[PDB]
């Protein structure tokens, strides 16, 4: 089977175009047809572009489609406008969906996220539990990629990250929680909470005691 | 066979026969008759069913 | 697998869409079980031919 690649998110100002590419892992893209879809928050997905270069009835043009081979990828091109098209787009070829790219208008000025790593409390360690608390805030847009590595390899066991959501100051907030045991807490030298936001990576590391 | 025989000595009749049950042989022979003007009388075998 | 489908269609220009259309069907139906092929031939003169 193949696998579909989409960028996590992208930001574009009104009056300018934006391109998002759907990439096929194995095999050629032209071997099968591809489709593009949009989904508003809480709204059912709606067809926007189907069968490579074909506009469904009701689609007001603008949204074109590139199916050139290139690096085994097919991209989606949108005319310059930011009225409502700020949504998440997915590519589907054959029983496989795309990752999805978040698109939003350029509103408030972008703010760098604030990374803070909280080592597990001693009282929790007494209860044979270890929770790693990582908090993020003052960032735009609400899309943060957070990864956890035990100083020698990424760790995905017990990780728990809150979905970003709009704050009360036209901003976004989120947090990441990692659940571990005292044996795992004391087994590794340090644990890292990497934060990725709009291509910006901020690293904060903590050590036991 | 049929039209090479026709191309050989000039026959006028091709009294025929068979041993199978494939009804399709009747239609093929009927097609032979149209474009060659040779009377043919199938008797026994596949070329028997009306 | 290789399920070849033929035709006795008219002049080769009309046959061109046949070779084009099958790939479209191949593109639509996605599996490694349905790899069709194509062949054709024009209307030769005479009936026996």
CA dist., res. A77 & res. A63, Å (int): 6
Q: Any idea of the CA torsion for C28, C29, C33, C35, to the nearest 10 degrees?
A: -30
Residues in chain B with CB shorter than 8 Å from the CB of C45 are none
- Identify which of C14, C11, C17, C9 has the alpha carbon closest to the alpha carbon of residue C40: C9
Give how far Cα A108 sits from Cα of A13, A64, A170, A174, Å.
11, 29, 7, 18
Give me the phi and psi of A60, to 5 degrees please. -85, 45
* Residue showing tokens 């100083």: A151
CA B20 from chain centre, in angstroms, equals 14
B35: annotated binding-site residue?
Answer: no
Beta strands in A40-181 (DSSP E): 46-49, 64-65, 73-78, 88-92, 101-104, 116-118, 130-139, 145-149, 159-161, 165-166, 172-180
Give how far Cα A181 sits from Cα of A125, A127, A135, A184, Å.
8, 9, 20, 5
Selected for mutation to probe chain C from A31, A35, A52, A96 (highest C CB count within 10 Å) is A31
SS3 content of chain A, % helix, strand, coil (to 5): 5, 40, 50
**B16 three-class SS:** strand
- The residues that bridge with A37 in the sheet, in sequence order, are A47, A90
- Identify which of A54, A65, A59, A108 has the alpha carbon closest to the alpha carbon of residue A85: A59
- The residues that bridge with A116 in the sheet, in sequence order, are A135
Q: How was this structure determined?
A: cryo-EM
Q: Any idea of the CA torsion for B15, B21, B26, B27, to the nearest 10 degrees?
A: -160
- The residues that bridge with A130 in the sheet, in sequence order, are A180
Interface contact C47, partner B, CB < 8 A: yes
For the beta sheet containing A18-24, the strands, ordered from the edge strand earlier in sequence to the opposite edge, are A4-5, A18-24, A73-78, A64-65
CA dist., res. A144 & res. A165, Å (int): 11
Most distant CA atoms of chain B, gap in Å: 30
- Between chain B and chain C, the number of residue pairs with CB atoms below 8 A apart is 5
- What is the stated resolution of the deposited model, in angstroms? 4.0
A13: Cβ–Cβ under 8 A, 6 or more apart, which residues? A82, A105, A106
User: Is the CB of residue A71 less than 8 Å from the CB of residue A81?
Assistant: no
Chain C residue closest in CA terms to B2: C48
Shortest Cα distance, chain C CAs vs residue A52, angstroms: 12
B9: Cβ–Cβ under 8 A, 6 or more apart, which residues? none
- Between chain A and chain C, the number of residue pairs with CB atoms below 8 A apart is 9
Residues in chain C with CB shorter than 8 Å from the CB of A33 are 27-28
CA dist., res. A147 & res. A201, Å (int): 11
* Residue showing tokens 């991209």: A75
Long-range contacts of C13-21 (CB under 8 A, 24+ apart): C15/C40, C15/C42
Interface contact C30, partner A, CB < 8 A: yes
Tell me the H-state helices in A51-191: 122-126, 182-187
A146: Cβ–Cβ under 8 A, 6 or more apart, which residues? A134, A136, A161, A174, A176, A193, A194, A195, A196
Selected for mutation to probe chain C from A94, A95, A96 (highest C CB count within 10 Å) is A94
Q: What does the buried/exposed string (b/e) look like for A186-196 if buried means 16 or more CB atoms within 10 Å of the residue's CB?
A: eebeebbbbbe
Question: DSSP secondary-structure letter at A81?
Answer: -
């Amino acid at each position: 089977n193949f696998m579909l690649t989409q960028p996590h998110s992208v930001s574009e100002s009104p009056g300018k175009t934006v391109t998002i590419s759907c990439t096929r892992s194995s095999g050629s893209i032209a071997s099968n047809y591809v489709q593009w879809y949009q989904q508003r928050p809480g709204s059912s997905p709606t067809t926007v572009i189907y069968d490579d270069n074909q506009r469904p009835s009701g689609v007001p043009n603008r949204f074109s489609g590139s199916i050139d081979s290139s690096s085994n990828s097919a991209s989606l091109i949108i005319s310059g406008l930011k009225t409502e098209d700020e949504a998440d787009y997915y590519c589907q070829s054959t029983r496989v969906f795309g990752g999805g790219t978040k698109l939003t208008v350029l509103g408030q000025p972008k703010a760098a996220p604030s990374v803070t790593l909280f080592p597990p409390s001693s009282e929790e360690l007494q209860a044979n539990k270890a929770t790693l608390v990582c908090l993020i805030s003052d960032f735009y847009p609400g899309a943060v990629t957070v990864a956890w590595k035990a100083d020698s390899s990424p760790v995905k066991a017990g990780v728990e990250t809150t979905t970003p959501s709009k704050q009360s100051n036209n901003k976004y907030a989120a947090s990441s929680y990692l659940s571990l045991t005292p044996e795992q807490w004391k087994s590794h030298r340090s644990y890292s909470c990497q934060v990725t936001h709009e291509g910006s990576t901020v690293e904060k590391t903590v050590a036991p005691t | 066979h049929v039209c090479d025989l026709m191309s050989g000595a000039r026959i006028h009749g091709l009294v025929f026969g068979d041993d199978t049950d494939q009804e399709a042989v009747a239609q093929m022979l009927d097609f032979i008759s149209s474009h060659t003007f040779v009377p043919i009388l199938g008797i026994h075998g596949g070329a028997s069913m009306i | 697998k290789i399920v070849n489908i033929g035709a006795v269609l008219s002049t080769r220009k009309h046959e061109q869409m046949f070779r084009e259309a099958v790939n479209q069907a191949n593109k639509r139906h996605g599996s490694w079980k349905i790899q069709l092929n194509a062949t054709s031939v024009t209307h030769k003169p005479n009936a026996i031919q």
